[PDB]
Amino acid sequence: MNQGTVNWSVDDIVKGINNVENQLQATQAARKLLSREKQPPIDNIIRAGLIPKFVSFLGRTDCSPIQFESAWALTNIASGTSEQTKAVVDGGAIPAFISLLASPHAHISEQAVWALGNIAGDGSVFRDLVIKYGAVDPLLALLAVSSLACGYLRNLTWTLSNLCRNKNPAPPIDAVEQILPTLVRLLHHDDPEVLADTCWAISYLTDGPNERIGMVVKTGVVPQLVKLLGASELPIVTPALRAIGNIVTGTDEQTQVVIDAGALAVFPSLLTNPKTNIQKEATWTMSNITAGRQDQIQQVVNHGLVPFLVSVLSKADFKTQKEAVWAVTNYTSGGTVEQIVYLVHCGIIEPLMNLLTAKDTKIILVILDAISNIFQAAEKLGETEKLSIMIEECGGLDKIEALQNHENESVYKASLSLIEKYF
């Protein structure tokens, strides 16, 4: 005998499922099996032809308890790998869960939303597959007209994010134009666990071409995404920082928006943040900002950000410096001459030189590329030599020459052209 519906043998559950009070305790037995702490017997249950039986319990319009107990079970089976989640899909379960959304029972539809989120959250296929089954309307409808439950709301915000995540292909554009509006009013909620999955859902959307990003920008969420960057709960900043950092990777006009949102006032704190991973992203977004037009670069300057980049490059670890490097390179690229001087005046020389030893030959090519930029700016000032001297007095000239005898052909071609043209 089993003590209650705890730790039933697989042989028992099958016998109980095949009276409804048996089918209920058995379905519940599978539930407790599929939700145990250690390695759930997901493989064993699927090979017992139980999956199809669980589908019927969903359509139990009369027996509420077994609908819930069953949905719970399947959900913990679609939580496994891609092959296990497939078996559920193959069992025509997708159409069923979308039908369980209608249920007046709070514990059922909420358990159906979750159930759908797992299936869609699998890959791009099952995502679009679920969306094709027109699950967008009901799920969004469950958000029509607070004061709704707290825990429930999260499962929706999560399942929705899984309807935007992953690429190749990207979630149907029409399925986004309709979901976005919802993701906006949600963005103005109060619950962290909800605001978190919100930003994630947004970042997923803004993880593509300028059209996708355009959709998310023309909705007016941007000003809010920057309002959360300063928030305390770290699980809120990361998802929003990505959403923002991904926005700037688009058009120059899509940057002037996030810049006018007040992002250039938060970065100073974002950079000197103890959380190292937040430094990387922060200074990463910095690059795409300085990559834009000139006047925009002139705004990165106005907010005294440059002196920060220097420190982010002269003290911070490597992965944050690699980004601080691009931010400097792009800066010198599109930047103006009177801005280049201001960058040299901030002592960008030595800090930039010290990195001419890294093992990543790519970052090296970039630094040389950034050097040439400063020189071409120095040329139109007739101060060609004056610059060369600085790069020499700080050992830089040696670091550049040490490249002459490097393994990468490009590094030689590049380090040599610099030595020749300006030395």
């Binding site: 939700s35 990505r242 990777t249 990463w284 795409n288 990559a291 792009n330």
Partner: protein
């Protein structure tokens, strides 16, 4: 220049989640524990539950508070048990206790503005015993008790009454603490409460008392009684011997923990919306002498007695919907020492069944409960119920006809269960008394019920041949035009015609044509009704087939109100031997619009009913005709409040029914008011008559009739207070004015006291 995000990540979040636990199924297991606790030992499970709840606080800090506050307002019969479970959660977590006191206080202020003054007290007495757990500072508790008694100096009286009660009701628990750290202002506060009680007006007492007698047990006002109890307590050095306090087994853990403060409470000001409780009257019929065999019964003034009855009362409230669970939890009642549970469990059930105005639950509820306790306590409880009955009987002389009714009902429906077995000779003292006076009347009305439940001859057997002089007469009809050679009777020949008409199943159109042979026509009805009922006098069904079949015939006759009466008058002259048959016919004649309520009211106060006007069936017909009127008034009001909701082409079609249902309401409410107004008109009439008469003829007023009628007038107010409290203006200006006989005007003034 611009670069995509390095690394092939996308956040590092779950593509799929797996439900490892649950909230709902958990908050049902937390609720279960917060409930089943106190069913191993007590201090063992409590201590265990203390931590188990804490290990669920990080996630359900706000939920756990929901259950505790709820359990605090729904289960007062466990007060202490939970004041401990909180004291422990306070001994381990401080911020928790504060997040609870702040919760209770808020929850309280809600049920106070929601006119739930009964649940309100439950919480008040909870905060009190929380002082006995170092969870609340003694001062801040007295602070709330300084603004409770402050109300007496503020408005209605019932309002002041409550706060003085909610305060004094708690002292049996938190009195030993209050009068220890602040005994200075304690007596000073008592000096305030003291005066107010004396200042109060005890006008409602005569109406709310079950027994108007003084001996042996007086029925004291629910406050003046409790007060004397608190006095006997203050004198006993605030020492009580019953209340179970588990926290006295946790002196270690508690003393260490700190305390909280009660925010300065200001009672929600009095509005014309607030509905305060009606004054009670402590029911008492037992003292220690009644039970010399068992433990000594806590005094009538003993503060322990205030608790025993209290907890027992609430225990019934919590499980009244289930008799097998009510009686169970009732018998298994705790206590510090041994007490006569039989004599309390019983005195409590009767304390409710006889409570005035109305009981907390349906009358038939207590009938089964007491019967269930006799199965659960075979050789201990029954004897107590038997004596309790004998005692009730001997004290019928000064009882209240209202209560007397429920006693007649319960007793008869009780015997009906146990073969009607009852030593009747026990009540031989009635064989030699005026039939009008209680005891003799009681035995008849009771033997009348036993008959209805069984039958005539059945009762004739069980009662001694000497009691056969009180047995209900052979319930057979009286056919005026029977086999009697009363040939010279008006319309004798015609009555014989109808006789064969019904005996061969006559049509409606037929019976009419025959009635065209009778000299509004009284005799035309005196023949049709007389004839019909007789032919269909075999059983109830045949009679119901009669009123059904020839419904049209009746409708045409009983069209005018005067005609409607004559139908009843005749229908009575035929069944003046079988009161039960009258009740149902008077019932089905109202639900089929043959006659109406306004007609019945008069027919009750008519001269044909002036002989049995004192009998019971006359009122089990009146307080059943009014019920139908109310269930009809509410039926529409409801049906209208569900048509307005539904309103949320079709618009007009629906707004149309709305108007028409509102005029239907205003109409039903009208006839209802007319009925009640007719009642008092007939009462004030027959009462003023009996007064002007006796006060002139030089005789005493207090007659068996005057008493068995004056209470029938009072019973109207009690059993229908909510509604009558709507005609106050009308009544005060038309019916009961200052120019009405004091003895009749008083009965109405006693009514105004219930909620004023």
């Amino acid at each position: 220049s611009r670069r995509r995000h390095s690394d092939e990540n996308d956040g590092g979040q779950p593509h799929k989640r797996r439900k490892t636990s649950d909230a709902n199924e958990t908050e049902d297991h937390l609720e279960s524990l917060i409930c089943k606790v106190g069913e191993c030992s007590l201090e063992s499970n409590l201590e265990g539950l203390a931590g188990v709840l804490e290990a669920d606080l990080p996630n359900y800090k706000s939920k756990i508070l929901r259950l505790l506050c709820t359990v605090a307002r729904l289960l007062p019969e466990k007060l202490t048990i939970y004041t401990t479970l909180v004291g422990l959660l306070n001994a381990r977590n401080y911020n928790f206790g504060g997040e609870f006191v702040e919760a209770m206080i808020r929850q309280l202020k809600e049920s106070l503005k929601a006119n739930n003054y009964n649940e309100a007290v439950y919480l008040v007495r909870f905060l009190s015993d929380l002082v006995n757990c170092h969870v609340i500072a003694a001062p801040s508790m007295v602070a709330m008790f300084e603004n409770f008694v402050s109300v007496t100096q503020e408005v209605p009286q019932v309002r002041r009454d409550w706060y003085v009660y909610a305060f004094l009701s708690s002292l049996p628990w938190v009195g030993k603490e209050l009068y220890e750290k602040k005994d200075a202002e304690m007596d000073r506060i008592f000096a305030n409460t003291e005066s107010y009680l004396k200042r109060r007006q005890k006008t409602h007492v005569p109406m709310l008392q079950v027994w108007t007698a003084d001996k042996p047990h007086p029925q004291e006002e629910y406050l003046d009684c409790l007060w004397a109890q608190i006095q006997k307590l203050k004198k006993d050095r605030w020492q009580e011997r019953h209340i179970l306090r588990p926290y006295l087994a946790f002196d270690s853990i508690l003393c260490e923990a700190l305390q909280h403060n009660l925010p300065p409470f200001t009672p929600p000001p009095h509005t014309e919306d607030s509905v305060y409780p009606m004054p009670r009257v402590i029911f008492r019929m037992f003292d220690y002498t009644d039970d010399p065999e068992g433990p000594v019964m806590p005094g009538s003034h003993s503060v322990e007695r205030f608790v025993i009855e209290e907890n027992l009362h609430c225990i019934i409230k919590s499980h009244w919907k289930e008799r097998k669970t009510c009686a169970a939890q009732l018998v298994s009642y705790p206590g510090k020492n041994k007490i006569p549970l039989n004599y309390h469990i019983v005195e409590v059930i009767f304390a409710e069944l006889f409570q005035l105005p109305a009981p907390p639950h349906i009358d038939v509820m207590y009938t089964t409960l007491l019967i269930e306790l006799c199965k659960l306590q075979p050789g201990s409880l029954p004897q107590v119920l038997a004596q309790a009955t004998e005692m009730l009987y001997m004290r019928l002389d000064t009882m209240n006809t209202t209560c007397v009714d429920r006693f007649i009902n319960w007793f008869s429906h009780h015997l009906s269960n146990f073969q009607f077995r009852w030593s009747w000779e026990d009540w031989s003292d009635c064989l030699s008394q005026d039939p009008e006076s209680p005891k003799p009347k009681f035995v008849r009305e009771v033997l009348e019920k036993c008959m209805r439940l069984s039958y005539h001859q059945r009762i004739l057997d069980i009662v001694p041949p000497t009691f056969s002089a009180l047995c209900p007469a052979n319930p057979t009809c009286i056919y005026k035009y029977g086999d009697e050679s009363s040939n010279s009777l008006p319309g004798h020949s015609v009555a014989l015609c109808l006789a064969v008409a019904f005996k061969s199943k006559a049509t409606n159109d037929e019976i009419f044509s025959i009635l065209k042979d009778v000299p509004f026509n009284p005799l035309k009805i005196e023949v049709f009704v007389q004839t019909l009922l007789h032919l269909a006098a075999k059983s109830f069904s045949h009679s119901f087939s009669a009123l059904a079949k020839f419904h049209e015939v009746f409708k045409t006759l009983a069209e005018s109100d005067e005609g409607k009466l004559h139908v009843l008058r005749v229908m009575f002259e035929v069944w003046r031997n079988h009161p039960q048959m009258i009740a149902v016919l008077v019932d089905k004649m109202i639900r089929t619009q043959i006659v109406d309520c306004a007609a019945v009211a008069n027919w009750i106060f008519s001269s044909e009913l002036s002989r049995d006007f004192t009998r019971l069936f006359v009122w089990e017909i009146l307080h059943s005709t009014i019920r139908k009127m109310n269930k009809h008034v509410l039926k529409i009001q409801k049906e209208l409040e569900e048509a307005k909701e539904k309103l949320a082409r079709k618009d007009g079609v629906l707004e149309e029914q709305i108007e028409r249902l509102q005029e239907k309401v205003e109409s039903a409410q009208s006839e209802q008011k007319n009925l009640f107004l007719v009642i008092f008109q007939r009462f004030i009439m027959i009462l003023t008559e009996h007064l002007v008469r006796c006060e002139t003829d030089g005789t005493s007023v207090l007659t068996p009739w005057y008493k068995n009628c004056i209470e029938r007038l009072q019973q109207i107010f009690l059993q229908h207070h909510q509604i009558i409290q709507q005609y106050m203006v009308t009544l005060e200006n038309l019916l009961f004015t200052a120019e009405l006989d004091p003895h009749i005007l008083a009965v109405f003034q006693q009514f105004c006291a219930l909620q004023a």
